[PDB]
Design a protein around this ligand. Structure first.
Ligand SMILES: [Ca+2]
Ligand SMILES: [Ca+2]
Length: 144
């Protein structure tokens, strides 16, 4: 609306699955859900959606927009055609956004999963690289 209705350390957590499928020849990325997202509207909620970019590259995907929730349930899967060893060249940028109708979308937070990450985000990538045809599901902290 017109009276700033669509306008914080804890940004939320995201549950992500990674599976390299040898039958299909590529990476399946699952965006399952987020929990305790930052509220980026005055009603105390957000309208979240998630964007994926497989860097450095078809490289991009996005989820649907869920309305008025800090705990969006997406259960959506995305596919990238890629050789397994070429995943060792890439990193997946994940960003979470609050859709607004009358202004720019608000940034909730993000995380990078891939070779230029650190800590548990790096390890998640490595577990997918080391384990073909296993679904590796982990929770990550969103960062600003
Ligand atoms: Ca907003
Ligand atoms: Ca909104």
């Amino acid at each position: 609306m017109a009276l700033y209705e669509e306008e914080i350390e804890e940004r939320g957590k995201i549950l992500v699955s990674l599976m390299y499928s040898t039958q299909q020849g590529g990476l399946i990325v699952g965006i399952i859900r987020c929990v305790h997202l930052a509220a980026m509207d005055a009603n105390g909620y957000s309208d979240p959606f998630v964007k994926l970019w497989l860097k450095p590259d078809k490289a991009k995907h996005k989820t649907q927009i869920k309305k008025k929730t800090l705990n969006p349930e997406f259960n959506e899967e995305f596919f990238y055609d890629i050789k397994h060893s070429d995943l060792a060249k890439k990193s997946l940028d994940i960003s979470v956004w609050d859709y607004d109708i009358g202004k720019s979308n608000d940034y909730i937070g993000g995380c990078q999963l891939g070779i230029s990450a650190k800590g548990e985000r790096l390890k998640h990538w490595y577990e997918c690289l080391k384990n073909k045809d296993k679904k590796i599901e982990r929770w990550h902290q969103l960062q600003n």
